[PDB]
């Protein structure tokens, strides 16, 4: 089974899921960095403008809904949502599963007013699930219908298909060459060992090793504040409140950035990480690499998001606790 994804400005990749009977439709991001499912709730005060601007789940319109009510708060890197748990049937890519998910009643304008999607579907392990709620992928596996306990992500370039998730395998149509796997450091987290990060000609980063969280829900490739400061200084980039910029005319001149993973070098060109909006020296162009301090126990750690996945088709293998990469087609 595959899920068709929409690509919004190269920063938000989302697909549709249906909740309830009759189905209530929601745009959601599939995030390997978290493990809970959530959508905005009809019980969310309209004082939260983000709730006024998104699809709201109304339990009183679903005959398959099952009440629970346990309160839950979900804390992400860029924001927080709070609400309560509910159960209902969820349709994802043709598969139907009963699932416990969050009905959000508090959703801050910043950053959710800037969200194209309505909610999130955690693709992480149950070990990271808040409130110990069984993750949707564990529930699907329990049905014993998938041919493989693995799911794969394909994120297309902005263009204007936006992207695609395959539940149960991989799509040969969107990758070439063969996969090269890296074993997970531990079950419970889609995190892997990274042997090093090189910029141009000088592996001046992640010497002695570091961690890499393969995060489909992250728009960019991120590193700790210290690591990014070095990487950026090397790039000649200036720091701003929420990102790093470079004078556009110099975007094409930026050096390659490479990521040593499992005995293979994964290299990005400047075209791969800079939002080349123009070429003027009087304009600033943002970079798809940010500074993000991810808290323990998962962090500190680098995060390989869309910027990376766009270049490399990614397969998450639950049966063998490994992650595979292959050149995206």
From Swiss-Prot:
Q: Does the record carry Disulfide bond as a key word?
A: yes
Give the Gene Ontology MF terms in alphabetical order: aspartic-type endopeptidase activity; insulin-like growth factor receptor binding; peptidase activity; signaling receptor binding
Give the intrachain disulfide bonds. Answer: 44-51, 206-210, 248-285
EC number assigned by the record: 3.4.23.15
Which reactions are catalysed by this chain?
Answer: Cleavage of Leu-|-Xaa bond in angiotensinogen to generate angiotensin I
Q: Spell out the GO cellular component terms annotated for this protein, sorted alphabetically and separated by semicolons.
A: apical part of cell; extracellular region; extracellular space; plasma membrane
Sugar attachment sites are: 68
Coarsely, its chief localization is secreted
Taxonomically, which superkingdom?
Eukaryota
Active-site residues per Swiss-Prot or TrEMBL entry: 31, 215
Question: What are the recorded Gene Ontology BP terms?
Answer: amyloid-beta metabolic process; angiotensin maturation; cell maturation; cellular response to xenobiotic stimulus; drinking behavior; hormone-mediated signaling pathway; juxtaglomerular apparatus development; kidney development
Query: Which keywords has UniProt assigned to this entry?
Result: Aspartyl protease, Cleavage on pair of basic residues, Disease variant, Disulfide bond, Glycoprotein, Hydrolase, Membrane, Protease, Secreted, Signal, Zymogen
Q: How is its activity regulated?
A: Interaction with ATP6AP2 results in a 5-fold increased efficiency in angiotensinogen processing.
Q: Where is the protein situated, by its record's location annotation?
A: Secreted; Membrane
Q: Which residues form the Peptidase A1 domain?
A: 13-326
Heme as UniProt keyword? no
Q: Which family does it belong to?
A: Belongs to the peptidase A1 family.
**Subunit description:** Interacts with ATP6AP2.
Reported disease? Renal tubular dysgenesis: Autosomal recessive severe disorder of renal tubular development characterized by persistent fetal anuria and perinatal death, probably due to pulmonary hypoplasia from early-onset oligohydramnios (the Potter phenotype). Tubulointerstitial kidney disease, autosomal dominant 4: A form of autosomal dominant tubulointerstitial kidney disease, a genetically heterogeneous disorder characterized by slowly progressive loss of kidney function, bland urinary sediment, hyperuricemia, absent or mildly increased albuminuria, lack of severe hypertension during the early stages, and normal or small kidneys on ultrasound.
What job does the chain carry out?
A: Renin is a highly specific endopeptidase, whose only known function is to generate angiotensin I from angiotensinogen in the plasma, initiating a cascade of reactions that produce an elevation of blood pressure and increased sodium retention by the kidney.
> Which protein is depicted?
Renin
**In terms of the whole protein, what range is present?**
74 to 406 of 406
């Amino acid at each position: 089974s595959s899920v068709i994804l929409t690509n919004y400005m190269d920063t938000q990749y989302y697909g549709e899921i249906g909740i309830g009977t009759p189905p209530q439709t929601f745009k959601v991001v599939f995030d390997t960095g978290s493990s809970n499912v959530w959508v905005p709730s009809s019980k969310c005060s309209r004082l939260y403008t983000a709730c006024v601007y998104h699809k709201l789940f109304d339990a009183s319109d679903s005959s398959s809904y099952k009440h629970n009510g346990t309160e839950l708060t979900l804390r992400y890197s860029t924001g927080t949502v709070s609400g309560f748990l509910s159960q209902d049937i969820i349709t994802v890519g043709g598969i139907t599963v009963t699932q416990m998910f969050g009905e959000v009643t508090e959703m801050p304008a910043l950053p959710f007013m800037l969200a194209e999607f309505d909610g999130v579907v955690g693709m992480g392990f149950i070990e990271q699930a808040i409130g110990r709620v069984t993750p949707i992928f564990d529930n699907i596996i329990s049905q014993g219908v998938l041919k493989e306990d693995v799911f794969s992500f394909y994120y297309n370039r902005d263009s204007e298909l936006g992207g695609q998730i395959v539940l149960g395998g991989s799509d040969p149509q969107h990758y070439e060459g063969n996969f090269h796997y890296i074993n997970l450091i531990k079950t419970g987290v889609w995190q892997i060992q990274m042997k090093g990060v090189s910029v141009g000609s000088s592996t001046l980063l992640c010497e002695d090793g570091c961690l890499a969280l393969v995060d489909t829900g992250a728009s960019y490739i991120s590193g700790s504040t210290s690591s990014i400061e070095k990487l950026m200084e090397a790039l000649g980039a200036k720091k701003r409140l929420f990102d790093y910029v470079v004078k556009c005319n110099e975007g094409p001149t930026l050096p390659d950035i490479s990521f040593h993973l499992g005995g293979k070098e994964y290299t990005l060109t400047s075209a791969d990480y800079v939002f080349q909006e123009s070429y003027s020296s009087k304009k600033l162009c943002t970079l798809a690499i940010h500074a993000m301090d991810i808290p323990p126990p998962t962090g500190p750690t680098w995060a390989l998001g869309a910027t990376f996945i766009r270049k490399f088709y990614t397969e998450f293998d639950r049966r063998n606790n490994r992650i595979g990469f292959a050149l995206a087609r």
